[PDB]
Amino acid sequence: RQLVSNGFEVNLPDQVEVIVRDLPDPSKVKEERTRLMGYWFVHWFDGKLFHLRIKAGGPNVDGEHRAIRTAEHPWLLRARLDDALEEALPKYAAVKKRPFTFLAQKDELIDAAATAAGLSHRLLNSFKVIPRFALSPKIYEPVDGTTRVGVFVTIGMRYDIEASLRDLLEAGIDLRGMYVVRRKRQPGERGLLGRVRAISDDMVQLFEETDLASVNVNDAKLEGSKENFTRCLSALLGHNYKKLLNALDDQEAGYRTGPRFDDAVRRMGEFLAKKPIRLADNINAQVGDRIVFSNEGQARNVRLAPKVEYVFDRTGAKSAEYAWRGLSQFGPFDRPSFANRSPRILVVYPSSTQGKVENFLSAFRDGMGSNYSGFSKGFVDLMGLTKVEFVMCPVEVSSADRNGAHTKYNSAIEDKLAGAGEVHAGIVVLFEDHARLPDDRNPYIHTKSLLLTLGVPTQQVRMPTVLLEPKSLQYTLQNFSIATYAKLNGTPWTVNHDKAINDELVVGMGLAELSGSRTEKRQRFVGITTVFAGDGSYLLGNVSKECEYEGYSDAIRESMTGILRELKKRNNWRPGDTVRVVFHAHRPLKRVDVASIVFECTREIGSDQNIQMAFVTVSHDHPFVLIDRSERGLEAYKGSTARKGVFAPPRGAISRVGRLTRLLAVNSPQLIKRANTPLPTPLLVSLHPDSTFKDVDYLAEQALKFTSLSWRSTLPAATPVTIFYSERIAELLGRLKSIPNWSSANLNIKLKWSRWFL
RNA sequence: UUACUGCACAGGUGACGA
DNA sequence: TCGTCACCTGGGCAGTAAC
Ligand SMILES: [Mg+2]
């Protein structure tokens, strides 16, 4: 039982001698660091300034002398290590500090990719993809009670377009509408300048500008987004352009695949271990062994959660390892009770797509047959319904109509429904050129708005999807079916849980940030989703209808206390029963908000029961990766030479970093998509220190299970539904709040049990 | 906006302190 | 106002759908 990390032990001195002076105002710290530059390392923490001498000779420093022992206060040397790593690698310029980040000295993957695909173009030399490395000094706990410092190595790719904007023009590339950034960024300057309206003299005309509406061709460059890469390259190359991307993708796989990443990490550790790292001129650190996660000795640092089971009945008896397998065999969890066995579904679509939409609806409702075993039965037999009646609502509108498409859809819905009686759901087909129009003329959001006001949830669909090859279409229709059923109040599946306490509530919060352009300040909206322990099963509760950023903490507390009150009433908790409340988000709550939440839930449940409360953050973008050297991977596809997910930990692997923190693996070899897919990064699950329920392993496993509860897809989500559904709610409600004639009135009436946000 | 996955880039932001 | 440690969210593009 071993998982290898991307980090190395750092052998530090036991002790370091330091000078301390009280400095209750931290505004002084910056000038003082400058004054003692070169001779002293300086660090402010907890009202006080800490000085570690790094070189002999003045200036002098007044203060109390103290021995800072590493085992007890590892933050001091962790911080010194950020800078010492920089100093240790003088030939690699920092592109960022804390963590030290830098570029490979030679390697340039576009040149290599071109050669390997046998492509060429004069300008290609001005498109650079360079490996980017970061070394992050992190505190971890090899076992409870003991801290150490590790150096964690992470790799990504710098994409840059150095080309002059002038050159890109004459090559036939249309630069209109592309974002542009400053070549040299003033200290504490923005990068984004805006979009390209046109070029004049030595002068770019910018719309959506962030500052001035003009800048010289010479002080600006295209932003190195994938969008600009593809737009420039396909113009200069197509259709050889895909050939270069695959080859670039192959090159990058050379640094990001499991074995190849493990090798790059090894080589980086060798390089840093070659010389001592000077913490001062007389005090050294040494980079040591690869940090592992194991159960050797007094370490209990790795476990494997059981496989999540998808459950399709209350008796626990009907279950599967995979959502579709189970759904296909058993039908949905709620089919014995599902109330509406003959849904009427409005189908809103551009009249000119009529035949394509019929083909799609036929495939959806009645299946694709045995040649497409992924979607044979169709929606009706899949979900155990009697029939589906489509009410056709053609719309006279063209993809060219960018300004009045939304008006036409809504006019057509209103006229059709006036004379049609009640519809239970709707499907809205959209042109690709309309899907991303601004919200004031976007038919997605206008039709979603109108139909949700009327209490009619929709599943929308873009024509490129409607037209998918049958091999892709069968999977499309799995996902479409599951969300549509849930939109009709259905519960497709649950995930196993064996209840140990009398009740458990999990609430999540999710954030969305909206603006009409990148110039405009993003406005924040929030959402809240609740999940309850059932008997053998987790059950999705209700969902917020207000979106609310200011006061989100009051909303969390209002939602938990109202829910605890109703759960108690439903279940009639007995004296001495234990109730557990778990909160999830992608960021940690404030201590003061945890205190207020704990106080109000405790007072609401009363002294008759025992309450356990945990506050959990789920992080995706941290410096930790898990390597399972025992995993050979799987056949990229049956039956190739290439392998996918080589060295990928199993789904459900949980490693201990520290008392409050676990790493959770979610993307197993099975789930990994391709040979060139990188070694996955696990989720970091952190418990808030003020939590009263402390078992982070159990909370990591619960988070795992909730990834499987997503009804947007047959495949699991990247984050538990408690957070993920909250983000979809927040985005939709925040958008809707700007749409004329939107009302939320039906969200808690007709739509109370509809999962309208999927 | 069927989704999952990945990546790039940009924007910054959060928590903890005194 | 700060210092310090940390990483989240939006927009877009490309490959594939846990046996
Ligand atoms: Mg959806």
DSSP secondary structure string, A154-176?
EEEEEEEE---HHHHHHTT---T
Q: Distance between alpha carbon A757 and the CA centroid of its chain, in Å?
A: 18
Q: Please state whether strand C lies within 7 Å of residue A708 at its CB atom.
A: yes
Residue nearest B9 (alpha carbon to C1'): A225
Q: Is A758 annotated as a binding residue?
A: yes
**Residue A757 CA, ligand 1 centroid: distance in Å:** 7
CA gyration radius, chain A:
29
A32 vs A14: CA distance, rounded Å: 27
Q: Tell me if residue A669 falls in helix, strand or coil.
A: coil
Token pair for residue A356?
Answer: 């394509």
Which residues, 6 or more positions from A561, have their beta carbon under 8 angstroms from its beta carbon?
A600, A601, A604
Provide the Cα torsion A645, A674, A621, A143; round to 10°: 0
The closest of A118, A108, A116 to A255, measured between CA atoms, is A108
Phi, psi torsion values for A20, nearest 5 degrees: -120, 135
Which amino acid residue lies closest to nucleotide C6, measuring CA to C1'?
Answer: A622
- Is nucleic acid strand C under 7 Å from A514's C-beta? yes
For residues A652 and A670, what is the distance between their CA atoms, to the nearest angstrom?
13
How many Å apart are CA A88 and CA A669, to the nearest integer?
37
Q: How many CA within 13 A on the CB side of residue A536?
A: 13
Nearest nucleotide to A727 (CA to C1') is: C9
Structure tokens at A438: 């601004």
DSSP state letter for A729: H
SS3 A259: helix
For residue A659, give the 3-state DSSP assignment. Answer: coil
Cis ω on the peptide bond leading into residue A99 (within 30° of 0)? yes
Burial A96-132 (b: 16+ CB within 10 A, else e): eeebbbbbbeeebbbebbbebbebeeebbebbbbbbb
Nearest to A209 by CA among A190, A226, A225: A190
At residue A466, what are phi and psi to the nearest 5 degrees? -50, -35
Judge if the beta carbon of A479 is closer than 7 A to nucleic acid strand C: yes
What secondary structure letter does DSSP report for A548?
B
Q: Is the CB of A323 under 7 A from strand C?
A: yes
Element of type H or E holding A345: strand A344-350
Experimental technique of record: X-ray
Sheet containing strand A319-320, edge to edge, reads A319-320, A310-311, A494-495
**CA A195 – ligand 1 centroid, Å:** 31
Residues 6+ apart with CB under 8 A from A267: none
The pair of three-digit structure tokens given for residue A529, joined into one six-digit string: 């989703």
A685 alpha-carbon distance from chain centroid: 13
Distance (Å) from CA A572 to C1' B6? 48
Rounded distance between C-alpha atoms, residue A660 and residue A139, angstroms: 12
Nucleotide of closest approach to A675 (CA, C1'): C15
Q: Would you say the C-beta of A299 is within 7 Å of strand C? A: no
Alpha carbon distance A668, A308 (integer Å):
13
d(CA A572, CA A714) in angstroms, rounded, equals 36
Residue type, A437: L
The nucleotide minimizing the C1' distance to residue A585's CA is C8
Q: Quick one: how far is CA A418 from the chain centroid? A: 42
Cα A746 to Cα A697: distance, rounded to the nearest angstrom: 40
CA distance readout (Å), A356 to A158, A347, A465, A469: 42, 13, 11, 12
Task: Please tell me whether any atom of strand C lies within 7 Å of the Cβ of A634.
Answer: yes
* Alpha helices per DSSP H over A67-132: 75-88, 109-117
In angstroms, rounded to a whole number, what is the distance separating the alpha carbons of residues A164 and A125? 12
**Strand C contacted by A670 CB (< 7 A):** yes
Distance CA A80, CA A471 (A): 56
Q: Which residue is nearest to nucleotide C12 (CA to C1')?
A: A227
- Which positions of strand C lie within 7 Å of protein CB atoms? 1-19
A177: left (phi over 0), alpha (psi -120 to 50) or beta: left
Distance from CA(A301) to C1'(C10), angstroms, rounded: 36
> Cβ(A409)–Cβ(A348) under 8 Å?
yes
Angle at A105 between CA A101 and CA A111, to 5 degrees: 115
Contact in structure between A310 and A323 (CB atoms under 8 Å): yes
**Cα–Cα–Cα angle for A570, A571, A574, nearest 5°?**
140
Phi and psi torsions of A693, nearest 5°:
-100, 130
| Structure resolution, Å | 2.0
